[PDB]
Design a protein around this ligand. Structure first.
Ligand SMILES: *[C@@H]1O[C@H](CO)[C@@H](O[C@@H]2O[C@H](CO)[C@@H](O[C@@H]3O[C@H](CO[C@H]4O[C@H](CO)[C@@H](O)[C@H](O)[C@@H]4O)[C@@H](O)[C@H](O[C@H]4O[C@H](CO)[C@@H](O)[C@H](O)[C@@H]4O[C@H]4O[C@H](CO)[C@@H](O)[C@H](O)[C@@H]4O)[C@@H]3O)[C@H](O)[C@H]2NC(C)=O)[C@H](O)[C@H]1NC(C)=O
Ligand SMILES: *[C@@H]1O[C@H](CO)[C@@H](O[C@@H]2O[C@H](CO)[C@@H](O[C@@H]3O[C@H](CO)[C@@H](O)[C@H](O[C@H]4O[C@H](CO)[C@@H](O)[C@H](O)[C@@H]4O[C@H]4O[C@H](CO)[C@@H](O)[C@H](O)[C@@H]4O)[C@@H]3O)[C@H](O)[C@H]2NC(C)=O)[C@H](O)[C@H]1NC(C)=O
Ligand SMILES: *[C@@H]1O[C@H](CO)[C@@H](O[C@@H]2O[C@H](CO)[C@@H](O[C@@H]3O[C@H](CO)[C@@H](O)[C@H](O[C@H]4O[C@H](CO)[C@@H](O)[C@H](O)[C@@H]4O)[C@@H]3O)[C@H](O)[C@H]2NC(C)=O)[C@H](O)[C@H]1NC(C)=O
Ligand SMILES: *[C@@H]1O[C@H](CO[C@@H]2O[C@@H](C)[C@@H](O)[C@@H](O)[C@@H]2O)[C@@H](O[C@@H]2O[C@H](CO)[C@@H](O[C@@H]3O[C@H](CO)[C@@H](O)[C@H](O)[C@@H]3O)[C@H](O)[C@H]2NC(C)=O)[C@H](O)[C@H]1NC(C)=O
Ligand SMILES: *[C@@H]1O[C@H](CO)[C@@H](O[C@@H]2O[C@H](CO)[C@@H](O[C@@H]3O[C@H](CO)[C@@H](O)[C@H](O)[C@@H]3O)[C@H](O)[C@H]2NC(C)=O)[C@H](O)[C@H]1NC(C)=O
Ligand SMILES: *[C@@H]1O[C@H](CO)[C@@H](O[C@@H]2O[C@H](CO)[C@@H](O[C@@H]3O[C@H](CO)[C@@H](O)[C@H](O)[C@@H]3O)[C@H](O)[C@H]2NC(C)=O)[C@H](O)[C@H]1NC(C)=O
Ligand SMILES: *[C@@H]1O[C@H](CO)[C@@H](O[C@@H]2O[C@H](CO)[C@@H](O[C@@H]3O[C@H](CO)[C@@H](O)[C@H](O)[C@@H]3O)[C@H](O)[C@H]2NC(C)=O)[C@H](O)[C@H]1NC(C)=O
Ligand SMILES: *[C@@H]1O[C@H](CO)[C@@H](O[C@@H]2O[C@H](CO)[C@@H](O)[C@H](O)[C@H]2NC(C)=O)[C@H](O)[C@H]1NC(C)=O
Ligand SMILES: *[C@@H]1O[C@H](CO)[C@@H](O[C@@H]2O[C@H](CO)[C@@H](O)[C@H](O)[C@H]2NC(C)=O)[C@H](O)[C@H]1NC(C)=O
Ligand SMILES: *[C@@H]1O[C@H](CO)[C@@H](O[C@@H]2O[C@H](CO)[C@@H](O)[C@H](O)[C@H]2NC(C)=O)[C@H](O)[C@H]1NC(C)=O
Ligand SMILES: *[C@@H]1O[C@H](CO)[C@@H](O[C@@H]2O[C@H](CO)[C@@H](O)[C@H](O)[C@H]2NC(C)=O)[C@H](O)[C@H]1NC(C)=O
Ligand SMILES: *[C@@H]1O[C@H](CO)[C@@H](O[C@@H]2O[C@H](CO)[C@@H](O)[C@H](O)[C@H]2NC(C)=O)[C@H](O)[C@H]1NC(C)=O
Ligand SMILES: *[C@@H]1O[C@H](CO)[C@@H](O[C@@H]2O[C@H](CO)[C@@H](O)[C@H](O)[C@H]2NC(C)=O)[C@H](O)[C@H]1NC(C)=O
Ligand SMILES: *[C@@H]1O[C@H](CO)[C@@H](O[C@@H]2O[C@H](CO)[C@@H](O)[C@H](O)[C@H]2NC(C)=O)[C@H](O)[C@H]1NC(C)=O
Ligand SMILES: *[C@@H]1O[C@H](CO)[C@@H](O[C@@H]2O[C@H](CO)[C@@H](O)[C@H](O)[C@H]2NC(C)=O)[C@H](O)[C@H]1NC(C)=O
Ligand SMILES: *[C@@H]1O[C@H](CO)[C@@H](O[C@@H]2O[C@H](CO)[C@@H](O)[C@H](O)[C@H]2NC(C)=O)[C@H](O)[C@H]1NC(C)=O
Ligand SMILES: *[C@@H]1O[C@H](CO)[C@@H](O)[C@H](O)[C@H]1NC(C)=O
Ligand SMILES: *[C@@H]1O[C@H](CO)[C@@H](O)[C@H](O)[C@H]1NC(C)=O
Lengths: 191, 154, 154, 191, 154, 191
């Protein structure tokens, strides 16, 4: 339009794909598949499914750290994810498998105020654009956010065009960087 | 703390200031430049998503230009300087508005006024979204009118 | 980061701005409305306790209004949002002034000037305490005089 | 009081009880008893006392997390309190008891730069309004605080009007959210 | 989120504001006083290293003056107060400028324009370094011209 | 040097020795020896060297905390140093010996994405005043920050007129306070 006779309304749309070489870019393909791309070769696929891939309660983080073999950026993202979960107290909910250097994590999401809510809050914040469709309501419900899916599976993946619902954006990860270790519980006298 | 990263895009212009978003920094658009009067507001205002995005893009440019890349990508640098570049509590405000079913900025689309003859432009403000649907221009037309009045005032 | 929460009001009022503390937000139990000029300072000022409390009360109102209450009381929302609502280092300043025996603000009591005829009011500033005794007005009368000059300047 | 002929000095006092449904509110009853009310139903009672109630040196936070009977808001407040203690290095000082979702923490507090000093330093910040009376010196000392009382006991309690000496205020709790994990010592090489 | 410590050095002066750095506070220099108009900028500016150092020095003075020292020195006090005294992201800016081979401030040396007759001074800006070499005065002469224009405007 | 006729350029320089009573001060003697002076009596000696002092792979932090024989200021600085290391995942790389209350930490620095990188970045931000001379390259290289020395040794020491090369400054330590626990991996499901 034309406001005050001389001023025309004009618009931008930032291409945040160009931030890929410095930043993680998070975005959504469909309601059950979301991605965090780190560069043009690596990323994490977050997936809400009823199909579990880990049938054990182990999560051998110390052995993985001792062996290395993993991408440090992806492990940093996983650490930011886990430390941003509010009120995590059921360790058996989270299992994982870092054998061979890969990254595979599984949060067991099986009426609110529970660990599934804490996992889902950090999930939707991590992928801010396009996570509302994954939720049952998508709005108006925070303390009892919930999805019908039973497992959140985070797996390392290679780069491909995945943002068919939302554009790539670092805003969710950059927001959650301040959330790390902010709403965790003490498990020891000496942390 | 507070954002401190300064935008340095003064060379090869008619005024020492402003900032230019190249065609790579924009979706389906060409080089678009903003003057010193608009960009200078970014040094002071704490609630502009576009200024945060300008600092992010400028830091990306300077980081690729002035730092030796690693063999495999690492995100140590952004984890180290994000609070220097942006206001994370602005992102917190937008998330709070998202969960409250208020329109919010998803940092994608922005709007500005542009004087037809002189070419002077205002600082781009964010086009708010709600449940995947951008707000029409009619939803915030009075904001556009106030911005035009501010432009005429200066 | 920095505070970014915007105060949502101005429905039914004579100007598009300001903020009104209702009968529930006040010990005296009387409505108190502050105009656009006073409340607009809260967008920029970083050392006003009243503005931080005003943002907290507005966020409480919006949170009970727009977000579903869980069956069991939870405090995750304020835990994440506090840095967007308040300057915690202002609380740090007041704590520091307390430990060093300097008069400080415990966020209870505030004072403002009020023009007798027009009803125009300044932004409320906090009434300081020292060891459980509110400062007498004579301890900061010149500050009140300075505020009056500002009201005469506007 | 009329200033410059036309400006009248007026005052207001904020009723912070209305913030109870969104955030904790802390207040003092007397020298020993302080309270952190959560909602209109729950809260913590912080008593400075000569008498102990736990009397052992176990704090099974992990088993409490497994059982998941506690209140999550109160446990988060306990975590915020403990992680705000600077230079805590004596696990024997803190004893706990979380039977059946209970919360019962005890700090042993038995001249500068000791665990008693850090615990009291965080105690004057958890309940900021009106906790100065508990110390022998209201002000002028920060690094060498003492109390004649020998134990700080934190226990979950029901709601009741305890705000006799100071009004409700979230300022202490909201202030200490940034204090968390800021002066804690390292106990592991991989935290 | 933002610094809040206020400088209180008003006693025994010709104006209620300003701040004076004593001989012990400076390296091979005598006592230097800065007026209200220059020091008052520190309340608003977020990218001034000298203002951060003024807050640090004032806090050091007040701490050694009002708080009883322990028998063995503690560090908890600064570990709390630093976010209220300084912008740590300004330090982060300077470190970022250091690693990308841009000139940066190491918080040692500062420059200001002093009016010869009246004695009015600018807010000191930091003298940047690069690899241990201070920039010559010619490297930022246009900044000095801009500062001179700024206080001619005042 | 006069500007606009009547405005004289003048110079100022701050003495940060006087801040020693309230905060640490970091500064450099030569390319290998760097210092963090807390007061006028105690501090830390950060030495890049090829001579190892600790032959074992222990860091008995818990025993040191229980005995409580150390300077709390120096252990706080050590905790700030270690928690600021980005992506530390080799517990064997760091050894300690706190017997008798002393402090003697040894980081084994023996490319991008390594323990030496994180330790050296935190070393630079801790000794930011004059540590740039400790590298092969002064600037333009952050991820692959490599020094020819094999060990970084942090030992408690007394006060002397140490730093010839750079002046005392709290800026490095004060900068690293916000970096604590900011980019650190998770070693266990409950932190
Ligand atoms: C920010 O950036 C700037 C520039 O990069 C940087 O400035 C440099 O600071 C350092 C540290 O102060 C300066 O180093 C000092 O330099 C003087 C002069 O050196 C020349 O002249 C002496 C004459 O004796 C020659 O010996 C020398 O070789 C040079 O030719 C030295 O005198 C200083 O040494 C004394 O002080 C040191 C620290 O106190 C002692 O360790 C040293 O032993 C010396 O003390 C002796 O003399 C004292 C005299 O007062 C006496 O009191 C003592 O008891 C003892 O007898 C020191 O080397 C360097 O020159 C500065 N460079 C510039 C360009 O200004 C800042 O360091 C940096 N700041 C921060 C915070 O990062
Ligand atoms: C900031 O600093 C100021 C100044 O130091 C503090 O102001 C003081 O605050 C205290 C606490 O509120 C106040 O003491 C009250 O005095 C009242 C009059 O004597 C008392 O009635 C009141 O006790 C009653 O209220 C409590 C809380 O409701 C109850 O626990 C108690 O049982 C009493 O109950 C009576 O009153 C309530 C209503 O409040 C009623 O429902 C009951 O039925 C019953 O009638 C307190 O003793 C001081 O008078 C204040 N002093 C000044 C100078 O203002 C302020 O608290 C500080 N604020 C913070 C947040 O730190
Ligand atoms: C912020 O909000 C807006 C509105 O809610 C949102 O805009 C949407 O972005 C998505 C993601 O790009 C758009 O989806 C595209 O739609 C076109 C339709 O023609 C498709 O062709 C696109 O698919 C192609 O490109 C994809 C990505 O490269 C490929 O994966 C795909 O296979 C195709 O090649 C894509 O689906 C959507 O149309 C817009 N909607 C609007 C109203 O603009 C934006 O995502 C949000 N931004 C952020 C950063 O969150
Ligand atoms: C917290 O409490 C648990 C046990 O919980 C207690 O007993 C349960 C049956 C329930 O009734 C609970 O309500 C009750 O509190 C402690 O678990 C113990 O952990 C230790 C190791 O820290 C175990 O010792 C090990 O045992 C294995 C073999 O099982 C050996 O191979 C190891 O070498 C080592 O000896 C101990 O067996 C285990 N006990 C139980 C009952 O599980 C837990 O230690 C305790 N934590 C704290 C902080 O107090
Ligand atoms: C990740 O980000 C980088 C940008 O940081 C992207 O590479 C950039 O791609 C653009 C083209 O889309 C390059 O611009 C043009 O390059 C051509 C030559 O190829 C040149 O003739 C044009 O004048 C213009 O410079 C840009 O230079 C290039 N920059 C870098 C740093 O590589 C990359 O495409 C992004 N990858 C992903 C997976 O998103
Ligand atoms: C959301 O998007 C993802 C990815 O586009 C969808 O998952 C994909 O589903 C298809 C069809 O089931 C899979 O194709 C099949 O792959 C197997 C193995 O390669 C092959 O044997 C089959 O013949 C077929 O090609 C595809 O691999 C799979 N990709 C991923 C990433 O899982 C998902 O179904 C979509 N969900 C929704 C809700 O739309
Ligand atoms: C993720 O969590 C869910 C919920 O805890 C797990 O499913 C649960 O698995 C247990 C153990 O098998 C089930 O209890 C079982 O009940 C049957 C009788 O119904 C009994 O025969 C078994 O011996 C056992 O007691 C529980 O009912 C079941 N609940 C649900 C919702 O499925 C699931 O196994 C977990 N997944 C992973 C990967 O850890
Ligand atoms: C997830 O990461 C793993 C480990 O890096 C990838 O598997 C490796 O792929 C490379 C490709 O050159 C092989 O050389 C390695 O031997 C593989 N490792 C193992 C343990 O099999 C895996 O491809 C990644 N996942 C996806 C979906 O891309
Ligand atoms: C907690 O705060 C709530 C919300 O402000 C208070 O509930 C209000 O109480 C007043 C007085 O009884 C009622 O008129 C309002 O309608 C209530 N508001 C809502 C939204 O329910 C409540 O009184 C406070 N509780 C306590 C124990 O102080
Ligand atoms: C602060 O008030 C509490 C609550 O009234 C006092 O604790 C009570 O003390 C009486 C003494 O006869 C006991 O019978 C009660 O059982 C106590 N109640 C609780 C809940 O513990 C306490 O003594 C007061 N403290 C001071 C210093 O006056
Ligand atoms: C709180 O700590 C003190 C100090 O350690 C304990 O009192 C000590 O108890 C031991 C064991 O009985 C005695 O040998 C010491 O002589 C006591 N010391 C002092 C100074 O009295 C006290 O028992 C602890 N309280 C609890 C409940 O564990
Ligand atoms: C019980 O609490 C009292 C305070 O009510 C403690 O205070 C001591 O009081 C005696 C009186 O003779 C003084 O000599 C001590 O110096 C006081 N102690 C302190 C630390 O200041 C008293 O210690 C407690 N009694 C016990 C644990 O038996
Ligand atoms: C502290 O919390 C415990 C556990 O929730 C409370 O005890 C419970 O009280 C409820 C009623 O409020 C009963 O239905 C439960 O059966 C009790 N649980 C157990 C395990 O006994 C306890 O009352 C709280 N303490 C105080 C002082 O209020
Ligand atoms: C640490 O800082 C203190 C406080 O500024 C310094 O003490 C000053 O020392 C000078 C020189 O001897 C005296 O003129 C001042 O009066 C002292 N001030 C105070 C408050 O005591 C001290 O010199 C500094 N320490 C070191 C080792 O430089
Ligand atoms: C520091 O790390 C280096 C590198 O791993 C260690 O040196 C190795 O020692 C083992 C001992 O079995 C030898 O087999 C390797 O060949 C050595 N490697 C190199 C590159 O020299 C060294 O022992 C470690 N130092 C300490 C003190 O723990
Ligand atoms: C590092 O600290 C240790 C422990 O404080 C110092 O050794 C102590 O020195 C004091 C001097 O008064 C003696 O009383 C202690 O007995 C010593 N302890 C031990 C275990 O030997 C040591 O001197 C400090 N190191 C340096 C280089 O100053
Ligand atoms: C505070 O006031 C009380 C009287 O209510 C007095 O006994 C006490 O000494 C005062 N403390 C300080 C710090 O002045
Ligand atoms: C800094 O100066 C030294 C000589 O003093 C030089 O060797 C070094 O190369 C310079 N810095 C860089 C990064 O080139």
């Amino acid at each position: 339009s034309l406001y005050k006779g001389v001023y025309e309304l004009q618009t931008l749309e930032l291409n945040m794909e160009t931030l890929n070489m410095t930043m993680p870019l998070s975005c959504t393909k469909n309601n059950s598949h979301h991605y965090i791309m780190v560069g043009n070769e690596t990323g994490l696929e977050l997936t809400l499914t009823n199909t579990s891939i880990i049938n054990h309660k182990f999560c051998n983080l110390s052995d993985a750290h001792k062996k290395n073999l993993y991408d440090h950026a992806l492990m940093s993202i996983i650490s930011t994810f886990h430390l941003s979960i509010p009120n995590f107290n059921q360790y058996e909910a989270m299992s994982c498998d870092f054998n061979g250097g890969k990254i595979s994590v599984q949060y067991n999401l099986s009426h609110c105020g529970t660990v599934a809510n804490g996992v889902l809050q950090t999930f939707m914040r991590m992928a801010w654009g396009g996570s509302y469709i994954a939720l049952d309501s998508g709005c108006g419900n925070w303390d009892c956010i919930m999805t019908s899916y039973q497992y959140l599976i985070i797996q390392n993946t290679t780069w491909e065009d995945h943002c068919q619902f939302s554009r790539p954006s670092p805003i969710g990860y950059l927001g959650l960087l301040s959330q790390r270790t902010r709403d965790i519980y003490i498990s020891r006298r000496l942390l | 703390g507070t954002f401190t990263w300064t935008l340095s895009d003064s060379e090869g212009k008619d005024t020492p200031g402003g900032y230019c978003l190249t065609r790579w920094m924009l979706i389906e658009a060409e080089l678009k430049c903003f003057g010193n009067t608009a960009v200078a507001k970014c040094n002071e205002k704490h609630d502009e998503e576009f200024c945060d995005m300008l600092r992010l893009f400028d830091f990306n440019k300077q980081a690729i230009q002035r730092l030796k890349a690693p063999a495999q990508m690492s995100i140590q640098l952004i984890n180290k300087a994000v609070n220097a570049l942006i206001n994370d509590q602005l992102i917190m405000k937008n998330h709070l508005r998202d969960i409250m079913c208020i329109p919010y900025c998803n940092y994608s689309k922005y709007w500005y006024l542009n004087h037809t003859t002189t070419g002077r432009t205002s600082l781009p403000k964010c086009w708010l979204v709600s449940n995947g649907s951008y707000l029409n221009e009619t939803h915030f037309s009075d904001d556009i009118e106030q911005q035009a009045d501010n432009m005429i005032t200066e």
